[PDB]
Amino acid sequence: HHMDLGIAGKSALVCAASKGLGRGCAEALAAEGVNVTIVARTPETLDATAAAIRANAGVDVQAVACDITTPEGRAAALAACPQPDILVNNAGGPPPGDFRNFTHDDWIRALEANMLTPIELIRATIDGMISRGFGRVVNITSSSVKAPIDVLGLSNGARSGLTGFIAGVARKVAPNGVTINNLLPGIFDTDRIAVTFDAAAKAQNISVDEARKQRMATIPARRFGTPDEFGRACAFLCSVHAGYITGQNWLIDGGAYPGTY
Amino acid sequence: HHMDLGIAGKSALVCAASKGLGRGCAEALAAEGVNVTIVARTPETLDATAAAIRANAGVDVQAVACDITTPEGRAAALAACPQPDILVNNAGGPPPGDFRNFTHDDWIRALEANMLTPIELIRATIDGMISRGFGRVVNITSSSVKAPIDVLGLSNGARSGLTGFIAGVARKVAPNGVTINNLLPGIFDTDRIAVTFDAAAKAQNISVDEARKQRMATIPARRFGTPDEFGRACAFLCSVHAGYITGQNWLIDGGAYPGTY
Amino acid sequence: HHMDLGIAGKSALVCAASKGLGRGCAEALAAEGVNVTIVARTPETLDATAAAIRANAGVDVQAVACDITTPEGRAAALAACPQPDILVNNAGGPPPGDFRNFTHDDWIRALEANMLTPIELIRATIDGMISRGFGRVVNITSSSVKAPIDVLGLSNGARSGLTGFIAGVARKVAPNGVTINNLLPGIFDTDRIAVTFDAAAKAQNISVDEARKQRMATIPARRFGTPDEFGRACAFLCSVHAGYITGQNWLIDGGAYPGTY
Amino acid sequence: HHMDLGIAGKSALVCAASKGLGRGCAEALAAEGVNVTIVARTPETLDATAAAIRANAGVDVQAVACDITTPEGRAAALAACPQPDILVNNAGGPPPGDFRNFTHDDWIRALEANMLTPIELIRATIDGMISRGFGRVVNITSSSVKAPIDVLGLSNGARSGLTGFIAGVARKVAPNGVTINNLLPGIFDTDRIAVTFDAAAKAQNISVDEARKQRMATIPARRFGTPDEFGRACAFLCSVHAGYITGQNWLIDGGAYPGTY
Ligand SMILES: NC(=O)c1ccc[n+]([C@@H]2O[C@H](COP(=O)([O-])OP(=O)(O)OC[C@H]3O[C@@H](n4cnc5c(N)ncnc54)[C@H](OP(=O)(O)O)[C@@H]3O)[C@@H](O)[C@H]2O)c1
Ligand SMILES: NC(=O)c1ccc[n+]([C@@H]2O[C@H](COP(=O)([O-])OP(=O)(O)OC[C@H]3O[C@@H](n4cnc5c(N)ncnc54)[C@H](OP(=O)(O)O)[C@@H]3O)[C@@H](O)[C@H]2O)c1
Ligand SMILES: NC(=O)c1ccc[n+]([C@@H]2O[C@H](COP(=O)([O-])OP(=O)(O)OC[C@H]3O[C@@H](n4cnc5c(N)ncnc54)[C@H](OP(=O)(O)O)[C@@H]3O)[C@@H](O)[C@H]2O)c1
Ligand SMILES: NC(=O)c1ccc[n+]([C@@H]2O[C@H](COP(=O)([O-])OP(=O)(O)OC[C@H]3O[C@@H](n4cnc5c(N)ncnc54)[C@H](OP(=O)(O)O)[C@@H]3O)[C@@H](O)[C@H]2O)c1
């Protein structure tokens, strides 16, 4: 038994996807027959992930080595995948800090990476989607837009800016068979959080395993998220069964956010 | 290809499901190998839907003819399906009117059908789900909990009451592999909205098609929702790939609700 | 200086107001020249509060000793104050417990007290406000409608039901110079709370002062709310300066709720 | 009667305040005895409004002619008012347009004016507020953060970015007697909307008065907001009676936004 998402043979541009949540989305789309173009900066891991997906899924896989948060990187991605049916927006997130230490340049860099980059990729791909009467955009954001994360003010700001803009464009382009939705991760078991736990353990004189355990104990689901399950939610949003879902912020966080809505 | 939801052979109790959104949920779950018990008041339609799901899905189908908004009906449903892995809560919705004409009996009827009935079925099934380390509850509610519907004050109130309570229990039971989420329909093309469009077309002296087209033009997606796609979202929430999603209100409305969140 | 709220000589019906937040609202309204009818069950305390407001504010004060959560109590309150310009809805809160121990009648009782009671008082007073082109309704609810409180499922449900219904009525009656808003307290230093901390101190063999300080340490403002400041926010909503505020949920909680919105 | 806000003799920096909502905030604070420093680019209207507030309120009024969205302008404002107790953040909003015509520079300018400028003024004033154990920051934003405005994508984005960041800093600084809240205008009767209706009428073959009338008819309160009542709400947030309100988004829109929350 398995659910046909109806997107085999379509094309997807999956940003920041040699590892982690982006990789999970690329894998899940390829599993459903989507030809995927994956983007990341470092060739070694990018080429390896592209080869793995090729050998596991049997779809066409393209790899673009670029910084997606530059105009030149966006142009390189679109040169490889010029008319995507499906766009998964993603890029590395901003550094932590106390708000009094954020510089103007820190703000601009976070806004470029996690707000203006997704917006520009939508701008560059939306006309083709509209012309074909089908389109799916999924933006990987953060629980930070629902409840601010203490040390991640740059995310609290930049990703909330993206989300507020997305609300408008989602409803504007909805008449044309295009949906635009955001996937908001709680804590997911990737290399990104291992850096955070490594520093937290060393500061607290406990093991990383113990620090991870203590964090899990505060999550209602009592675990971290997996890149696999994140990618499956992405694939569902990109399917022919989610065409009546647009402008939505899907929080995938094990219940950690306490708000009713 | 096709995505394996991992719930073949599980049991679901699907309330108010001979027609409409409930039937869509039952069929989508049966398509993934779930043995479904479906509940409705009218035996003829209920038996015909049960027979159709048997013929199409090949799963075990039980049909319980009862009023799910009564304790005798809830007991009869649970007697047939006493340890469901999956509970889909649903019942008929309240009648329209101006708030100054709502009677006390009106309020109790709406609160019983669309708040206390789902709560009682959760109370009666949660301990078995917890003991097995797996459970899925999906409550069919309404866009009325995000933005009040003019003439449906009884829904605006009763379903918001359910949602506020669900927020707490979803997080309370999450440590045990149980998730509880709400699916909020916008306008879906069922028999319930045909009653509204027939009375509109006849009153205004226009065709039903014209009356429906006027409403569609106000929806960003420019169509109504289908019971099939509603059921597919339900099936995803009930899957092994949605275990990190709980306490969430999933609005499926073609972008009609204008709020950013 | 001092801000003239423009409501001197108007009439207010203030429910559940011999003590606590309700008394704070009655005193703040009376300080602005509003003639207040205050309602509580216990005559001794009610009369003492009524006499203190008379002495300090110099307005007309009526005391009605009744149970506002019954139809007979509402009839008595409205007989004494049949055409209020201002209605402050309030009642005792529901008891704590685990949802598996809520009886069906526990739910009915909480729904009657904290949802249907304020709805019926609005229905009985809204026509007069509309006919005069001025009206203010303020409903005392709870932070429980923004984030569920663990042991207060009955509040999480009933007050959320009220709130969803209020959303519709507020926008329905806004053309007639009537506003309807909700005031959502976080933890406020009333007798209800003082009893709770007496139990915590005794259970832990610590002083009441230490038990209270333990809770304050988790609140961003690092204190509890005062009934006075709650009443002042109520009075501002009831003023001629808040006529463009309706359907709003004002959370007054020292930042304790972590959600962005 | 009249309510004492307890802020006579305190100092406020009120940005973008020779006209409109900013002027309304400055006048309301001055009316409660606050010494106000008002900032605007054009000297003619700035000096006239400063003279009016001096004559009306008898407080100290400083006028700074500068563009508050530049570092040099922020520095000039702070030179005049180096240790404000109260900061009202405000600046001119972004131009309208279709999202496909927004340039990278359009985005940066909107982000600078309506997100990074308020953030930098908070960073420059928060230390002193904390050191005195009292502070009030009110950010004038927009209903666009609750529901996107069709042609104002630059606002939908930039002001949502501010709001997501403010959520974190409000809770961070709350232990020190500082509150940070946002005031979200719906449509207010200022010079800003005259330009909007001047274009809306010129294209619709109706008068600006007719276009205004038709827009009013869609607002539940059936009118536009006044700068006076907006300023009064600002003054209440800045008072000693609002110290338990922080991190809140106060929507002042006559009920036009349809969302329950
Ligand atoms: N993990 C969580 O708990 C969590 C939760 C919420 C939000 N997030 C956010 O979700 C996003 C993905 O996080 P993750 O945990 O999946 O991180 P991850 O495991 O480190 O994966 C990041 C991936 O993106 C690529 N990448 C990063 N910046 C890029 C850029 N500018 N251009 C192109 N490729 C880029 C990386 O490869 P290269 O380094 O070779 O480019 C890698 O393939 C981040 O924005 C993160 O802040 C994460
Ligand atoms: N359609 C929409 O646009 C929409 C949107 C939001 C919310 N909703 C809500 O979603 C729910 C389902 O609506 P729908 O459009 O699917 O309606 P529908 O097409 O009329 O189907 C309702 C189903 O529920 C059954 N049912 C009704 N009352 C029952 C009861 N007391 N006990 C057992 N079964 C009962 C009906 O069969 P019997 O009559 O034989 O019992 C039928 O099988 C309602 O609460 C509705 O208000 C609908
Ligand atoms: N304090 C908080 O932290 C907090 C926070 C959120 C919500 N709330 C809610 O706010 C409401 C007021 O709480 P509070 O802290 O102000 O309580 P409080 O200090 O105990 O005052 C309650 C007042 O209401 C009266 N009352 C209670 N039940 C009544 C009834 N059936 N009919 C008429 N009068 C009635 C009481 O007098 P009699 O006993 O003589 O009738 C008393 O005057 C409650 O619903 C509470 O749950 C409180
Ligand atoms: N009116 C509404 O319906 C409405 C609703 C929601 C949001 N808003 C937003 O609220 C803000 C205020 O709007 P409003 O209606 O009050 O406008 P307004 O009547 O045109 O007043 C704007 C004031 O700000 C000053 N100003 C503008 N940009 C400035 C800058 N960079 N530096 C310093 N002073 C500056 C202007 O004077 P100078 O030109 O001489 O500098 C003037 O004193 C805007 O961001 C607007 O988009 C307005």
Short mmCIF file of C-alpha atoms in Angstrom, two decimals, chain D residues 56-249:
data_model
loop_
_atom_site.label_atom_id
_atom_site.label_comp_id
_atom_site.label_asym_id
_atom_site.label_seq_id
_atom_site.Cartn_x
_atom_site.Cartn_y
_atom_site.Cartn_z
CA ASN D 56 -1.15 72.93 23.62
CA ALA D 57 0.72 70.95 26.26
CA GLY D 58 3.24 73.19 28.00
CA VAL D 59 5.93 70.51 27.94
CA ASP D 60 9.43 70.68 26.51
CA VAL D 61 9.34 70.01 22.76
CA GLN D 62 12.46 69.36 20.70
CA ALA D 63 12.33 69.19 16.92
CA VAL D 64 14.95 67.26 14.94
CA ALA D 65 14.98 67.65 11.15
CA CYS D 66 16.39 64.39 9.80
CA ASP D 67 15.72 61.17 7.92
CA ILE D 68 15.35 58.69 10.77
CA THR D 69 16.11 55.78 8.43
CA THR D 70 19.81 56.73 8.20
CA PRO D 71 22.51 56.21 10.86
CA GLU D 72 23.23 59.95 10.76
CA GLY D 73 19.57 60.76 11.36
CA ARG D 74 19.33 58.31 14.25
CA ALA D 75 22.43 59.93 15.71
CA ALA D 76 20.91 63.42 15.38
CA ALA D 77 17.70 62.28 17.06
CA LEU D 78 19.64 60.70 19.93
CA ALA D 79 21.85 63.78 20.32
CA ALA D 80 18.70 65.79 21.05
CA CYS D 81 17.10 63.05 23.18
CA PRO D 82 19.91 60.84 24.48
CA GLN D 83 18.12 58.95 27.28
CA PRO D 84 14.43 58.55 26.39
CA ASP D 85 12.11 56.73 28.74
CA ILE D 86 9.73 56.22 25.81
CA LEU D 87 10.52 55.44 22.16
CA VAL D 88 7.85 55.56 19.44
CA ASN D 89 9.27 53.93 16.31
CA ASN D 90 7.88 55.09 12.98
CA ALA D 91 8.98 56.04 9.45
CA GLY D 92 7.40 56.42 6.04
CA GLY D 93 6.16 53.17 4.56
CA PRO D 94 7.14 51.50 1.29
CA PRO D 95 5.61 52.14 -2.12
CA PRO D 96 2.93 49.86 -3.57
CA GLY D 97 3.47 47.50 -6.45
CA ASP D 98 3.20 44.01 -7.84
CA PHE D 99 5.75 41.64 -6.33
CA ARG D 100 7.27 40.85 -9.74
CA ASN D 101 8.32 44.52 -10.05
CA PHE D 102 10.03 44.80 -6.65
CA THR D 103 13.77 45.29 -7.10
CA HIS D 104 16.46 44.15 -4.71
CA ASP D 105 16.94 47.83 -3.82
CA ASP D 106 13.20 48.21 -3.15
CA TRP D 107 13.49 45.40 -0.61
CA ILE D 108 16.58 46.82 1.09
CA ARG D 109 15.00 50.27 1.38
CA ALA D 110 11.80 48.87 2.88
CA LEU D 111 13.76 46.68 5.28
CA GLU D 112 15.96 49.62 6.32
CA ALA D 113 13.05 52.00 6.88
CA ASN D 114 10.50 49.73 8.55
CA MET D 115 12.56 46.98 10.20
CA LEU D 116 16.23 47.83 10.74
CA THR D 117 15.65 51.49 11.74
CA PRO D 118 13.35 50.59 14.69
CA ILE D 119 15.77 47.80 15.70
CA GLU D 120 18.75 50.14 15.73
CA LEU D 121 16.89 52.76 17.77
CA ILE D 122 15.98 50.08 20.31
CA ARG D 123 19.62 48.99 20.44
CA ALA D 124 20.72 52.59 21.01
CA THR D 125 18.20 53.32 23.81
CA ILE D 126 17.60 50.01 25.61
CA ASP D 127 20.67 50.16 27.90
CA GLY D 128 19.49 53.39 29.52
CA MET D 129 15.93 52.16 29.97
CA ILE D 130 17.21 49.00 31.65
CA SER D 131 19.51 51.04 33.89
CA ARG D 132 16.52 53.08 35.13
CA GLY D 133 14.20 50.09 35.54
CA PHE D 134 11.56 51.68 33.30
CA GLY D 135 11.12 51.79 29.55
CA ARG D 136 8.42 51.84 26.89
CA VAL D 137 8.90 51.10 23.20
CA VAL D 138 5.92 51.30 20.82
CA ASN D 139 6.50 50.33 17.19
CA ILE D 140 3.99 51.66 14.66
CA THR D 141 3.60 48.83 12.16
CA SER D 142 0.54 47.85 10.09
CA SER D 143 -2.37 45.48 9.76
CA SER D 144 -0.18 44.02 6.96
CA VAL D 145 1.52 41.78 9.55
CA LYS D 146 -1.85 40.12 10.39
CA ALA D 147 -3.18 39.87 6.82
CA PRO D 148 -1.13 40.79 3.74
CA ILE D 149 -2.20 43.89 1.86
CA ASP D 150 -2.46 43.16 -1.88
CA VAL D 151 -0.23 45.88 -3.31
CA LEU D 152 1.94 46.36 -0.23
CA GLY D 153 4.20 43.30 -0.37
CA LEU D 154 7.17 45.39 0.77
CA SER D 155 5.27 46.19 3.98
CA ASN D 156 3.91 42.65 4.32
CA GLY D 157 7.53 41.54 4.40
CA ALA D 158 9.50 44.26 6.17
CA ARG D 159 7.06 44.91 8.99
CA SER D 160 6.55 41.20 9.63
CA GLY D 161 10.32 40.93 9.94
CA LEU D 162 10.36 43.63 12.60
CA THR D 163 7.50 41.96 14.44
CA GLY D 164 9.18 38.56 14.58
CA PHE D 165 12.33 40.11 16.01
CA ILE D 166 10.44 42.31 18.51
CA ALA D 167 8.82 39.18 19.96
CA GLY D 168 12.21 38.00 21.20
CA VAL D 169 13.65 41.27 22.50
CA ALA D 170 10.40 42.17 24.31
CA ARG D 171 10.65 39.04 26.40
CA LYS D 172 14.43 39.39 26.87
CA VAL D 173 14.25 42.87 28.42
CA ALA D 174 10.99 42.44 30.34
CA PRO D 175 12.77 41.62 33.68
CA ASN D 176 14.02 45.23 33.76
CA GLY D 177 10.72 47.11 33.76
CA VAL D 178 10.81 47.74 29.99
CA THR D 179 7.93 46.85 27.69
CA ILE D 180 8.04 46.67 23.90
CA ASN D 181 4.76 46.49 21.99
CA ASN D 182 3.52 47.06 18.46
CA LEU D 183 0.58 49.22 17.38
CA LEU D 184 -0.93 47.98 14.12
CA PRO D 185 -3.09 50.55 12.29
CA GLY D 186 -5.87 49.59 9.96
CA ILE D 187 -6.86 52.50 7.70
CA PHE D 188 -6.39 55.90 9.36
CA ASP D 189 -7.47 59.30 8.04
CA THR D 190 -4.04 60.80 7.27
CA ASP D 191 -2.32 62.33 4.26
CA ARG D 192 -0.94 58.88 3.41
CA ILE D 193 -4.31 57.49 2.37
CA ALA D 194 -5.34 60.58 0.40
CA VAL D 195 -2.71 59.70 -2.20
CA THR D 196 -4.04 56.13 -2.29
CA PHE D 197 -7.65 57.17 -2.83
CA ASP D 198 -6.52 59.86 -5.29
CA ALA D 199 -5.16 57.09 -7.51
CA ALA D 200 -7.95 54.60 -6.73
CA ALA D 201 -10.56 57.13 -7.89
CA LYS D 202 -8.64 58.32 -10.96
CA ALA D 203 -8.62 54.75 -12.29
CA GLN D 204 -12.15 53.72 -11.23
CA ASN D 205 -14.02 56.70 -12.79
CA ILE D 206 -15.41 57.72 -9.39
CA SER D 207 -14.46 60.53 -7.05
CA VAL D 208 -11.96 60.11 -4.23
CA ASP D 209 -14.85 60.79 -1.85
CA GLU D 210 -16.84 57.96 -3.43
CA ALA D 211 -13.85 55.61 -3.28
CA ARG D 212 -13.39 56.54 0.40
CA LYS D 213 -17.09 56.02 1.12
CA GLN D 214 -17.07 52.59 -0.53
CA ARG D 215 -14.02 51.54 1.47
CA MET D 216 -15.60 52.75 4.74
CA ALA D 217 -18.68 50.65 4.01
CA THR D 218 -16.56 47.49 4.18
CA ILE D 219 -15.07 48.28 7.62
CA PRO D 220 -17.21 46.89 10.48
CA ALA D 221 -16.82 50.14 12.43
CA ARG D 222 -17.91 51.95 9.20
CA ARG D 223 -15.30 54.71 9.56
CA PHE D 224 -11.57 55.32 9.29
CA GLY D 225 -9.37 55.64 12.36
CA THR D 226 -8.28 59.02 13.75
CA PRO D 227 -4.69 59.94 14.62
CA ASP D 228 -6.00 61.18 17.98
CA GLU D 229 -7.39 57.82 19.09
CA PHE D 230 -4.25 56.07 17.78
CA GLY D 231 -2.11 58.36 19.93
CA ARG D 232 -4.29 57.71 22.98
CA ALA D 233 -3.70 53.96 22.65
CA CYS D 234 0.03 54.67 22.35
CA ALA D 235 -0.10 56.79 25.51
CA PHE D 236 -1.84 54.00 27.42
CA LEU D 237 0.88 51.52 26.40
CA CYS D 238 3.46 54.05 27.55
CA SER D 239 1.79 54.51 30.94
CA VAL D 240 2.50 53.08 34.37
CA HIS D 241 -0.72 51.07 33.95
CA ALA D 242 0.59 48.98 31.03
CA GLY D 243 3.69 47.52 32.68
CA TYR D 244 2.32 43.95 32.40
CA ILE D 245 1.73 44.25 28.63
CA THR D 246 4.76 43.33 26.55
CA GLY D 247 5.40 41.59 23.26
CA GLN D 248 1.82 42.36 22.19
CA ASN D 249 0.49 43.33 18.77
#
